[model samples]
Target: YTPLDRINDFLDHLNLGERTIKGCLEAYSCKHTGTDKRLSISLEHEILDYLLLSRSSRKALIYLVLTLYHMYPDYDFSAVKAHQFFTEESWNTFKQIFETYMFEASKEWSETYGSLLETLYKALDEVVKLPECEIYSYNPDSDSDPFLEKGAIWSFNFFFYNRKLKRVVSFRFSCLSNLVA
Candidate 1:
């Protein structure tokens, strides 16, 4: 009936425990829109429109977000949210962030989650088809954050948006200190 309903059905297929399911749902919730001018425009309505456009695209977006949740259970993605209409300057900023953070951290994970992470990256490439689509990410700064106390050294909350498709998939990943070695 709704995008959330379809996302829930997909989540059910994962066979996660009740607590894990609850956590995933909570993490997926977006509580803040931030103060960015881009964030002023709501994509909530368009997301529903996109969901009705094509089933495969909807499933791909769902798979991307849920896969990130499965791979990084310790990361808190509650702040991750998406916005519409990125400018050239904002897109450039995204590229710089991706190069600075993601490339260096790509090899930081063990084989277990590393393979899964790699698969997600490749899937994102296929789905977004870079340069054609734009991505914007935010990294929250807080000294008293719990994830940092839990040994998370670095993190990224990325929003991959396909303007033509009228959809966006947002998720976050935090690399724990133990994973760095």
Candidate 2:
């Protein structure tokens, strides 16, 4: 069997939001192997169902979706899953509404010479490294500057696609900045 790159490479061709959900599914699955298979199926359904459908701009709906994703009280998943799952929903929703909301938000943040969407995707690539790939930890009372750097792949020596090697990755490269913050 091949090695586990955290089970996220399956969504390599997808955006961070989709990749996040894919990660959630795999993590939930491996965790339940020979243990609590039924609940695992249900929890997986929650993720599968939500990802399968289109959500709206209602904050309550978003919150509820995230809350419903709580498999902790009923399941034995780790604490990290909460952050991971909610992050998945939040950004997945943003992506679904990237044109609807995030797109507009970026537009408002853009200057005459540049685009915020471009910058956002750049920072987003950094977040792609997470289990539920997404942009988390935003400052409420501050500008979105940190989340606006553009450097999804520039930081890595071996890019994801058709890189010159298998399991390719160069840790020697810089990760602190995606595009020279």
Candidate 3:
């Protein structure tokens, strides 16, 4: 299947809201194809194993990676190597985004999902404790920040990978400050 198809399937499975699905699709359509390295089944299985071991649900991990793709359609996520797209400054930026989006969006979708942000946070917290897991981050402030243009006051992206599993879970966080204020 194509990247578009995979993305569609992911969003469908996640049951993300209509607005989020539409927004992701629109952003995806604008990107050039044939560049993304397809995520292998074995790699997927590895990530799943790691998540299970960390006591995190598979759905939450999938949601995290899918959101990463939705945020940065151009980046190649096959390897998730650090220092290539992540740095200390970027990690701080991502923390801010994670806090804002998790709180704001959770409140908006509480009726349907019952605090999804909390689940994500809990999962990440557990996963980070794994001895084999490594974290990486990136903030687009130096370049063209996509979220900023989309009216997000700030945004950030990050990844968690298992050294032995050779698998990675990515996350993108962003928010419009005006709405909160």
Candidate 4:
């Protein structure tokens, strides 16, 4: 049996505890979507590792990733962001291209498939915000201005005003990274 089948068998046993394997397949595995038609993880890993690890050009990885997204529309790309698949820099590059492609493809869809031109534009516009102020959260006790705190290296609070919402949103970040608003 393949790894997928073995995993299903393991799951069946786990769910069937104390019950016999007979007729358990129907109850336990019937609802499961097996990987028979999907590209196996190992197969995709081989492709990614060969292309990304060999320090291949961004073009190569971009083509592969986009093709995979198109060919396997249902494939879960959460693995790319999950940290084990590719190198950090490669994943970052891949993610940027992926997001860019998503936008372009969305626009592409609007042209032929359907129109999401204004909807997607507004959604993206609402989230892309500019920083209004920065406050360092060094000492939580005082709750005063962060610029006054001694430990200036501590966490920081940033506020951004979304023009669309007409309200301010604040977030804290200990380090500079992706901040999802």
Candidate 5:
């Protein structure tokens, strides 16, 4: 879909206004294709520009940061993937955006951050206790996040990937925030 049109529709669905839509375009670094018939987002440093200039709501920015972290779960965020994904310069650019967003947004949603971070921390603490290979894949039910345990899984870790050890973690993370709130 056209970059502007798609973003417009997406913003409407999220109940955000023109200011947010404009800032989100820059934050996501929209790229046009074939005379703007379609657009692809290559997340980059410009997000900071919009965050600095735009007065977006805390919920919007926090959701953006969380979504971004999950969107490309294997982005070169650690040492090796970090180098593989972006130059230190670009990675640091987006990193700053997230840091700023998280800091500001979490103040407004401290409980959400607490639960998410606690869940992740506890999950990691437990997962690491298992054999590395044993914990390689996460079956949604058996290995699911505590909040999303409502669903069941087959015998296999159906959504497993080499880099996706956390499978559906953040997806459920945000949803559960309301329970505690």
Candidate 6:
């Protein structure tokens, strides 16, 4: 066990999915663990909407996968108090925070937004279902990279690494603002 005082950096990262949720609840156990259906349903709508409209599938999948790993159980069981913290206006403001960066939003200056998604999910289980154990099993850190046709599989070695891993393919999402003729 590490001492809390040593973490001088004010919890610098957001671990989005499960085990950490359990740990957080354990720490805040007596105080902040419960669910509200009104809150959860609204959160669910926000998450799904983001996933549907996002330009990046990889990040969306990553978010989903992370949720599955750390937040799925409590989510599925409807056991976190999402509604207590966010009213409708507050929820709308929360949506704006993830306008570009879903995974990186914790780096934003909002103290109300917990630094970790696992904590968010635990506190707002109604937004979505967390992946089950089977679903959460695929740990990116543990898996071997899947083979892909090289973006420019160089015959030689220098700068072999490429943006293929992070490439974003553009899609035309038509909406009222961009109603092209």
Best by lDDT: 3
Count steric clashes of candidate 4: 0
Model 5: worst 10 consecutive residues (lDDT sum): 153-162
Instruction: Record all residue pairs in model 6 with backbone atoms less than 3 Å apart, i.e. clashing.
Output: 17-70, 18-70, 34-80, 34-81, 35-80, 40-126, 44-127, 68-131, 72-130
Write model 6 residue lDDT over 36-131, tens digit each, in one string.
233434445554564412233322333232232233344332111221111122233433433333433344325644344444434333222222
TM-score of model 1 (CA atoms): 0.35
Q: How accurate is candidate 5 locally (lDDT)?
A: 0.26
| Candidate 4, poorest ten consecutive residues by summed lDDT | 22-31
Better of 1 and 6 by TM-score: 1
> TM-scores of the models, in the given order?
0.35, 0.24, 0.40, 0.17, 0.20, 0.17
Q: What ordering of candidates by TM-score runs from best to worst?
A: 3, 1, 2, 5, 4, 6
Q: Which stretches in model 2 have alpha-carbon errors above 4 Å? A: 1-97, 100-104, 112-114, 129-181
Lowest lDDT sum, 10 consecutive residues, model 6, at 153-162
Error of 4 at 57 (Å): 47
lDDT by residue (115-134, candidate 3, tens digit) is 44445545554534334455
lDDT of each residue in 66-160, candidate 1, tens digit only: 33443454654321221111112245675565456544333332322323234444555554554565444433355533322244445555566
lDDT of 5 by residue, 1-181 (tens): 3433332343232312221111122112211344111111222333333332123222222223333344444432222122122211122443343345333323323533333233323443343321221111122222323222342221111110112231111211111111221
Question: Model 2: how far is 49 from its true place, Å?
Answer: 14
Please report the candidate that would top TM-score against the real structure: 3
- lDDT at residue 152 of model 2 (Cα atoms): 33
Shift in Å, residue 90, candidate 1? 7.0
lDDT score, candidate 6: 0.25
RMSD of every prediction? 13.3, 15.4, 12.1, 26.1, 19.5, 20.9
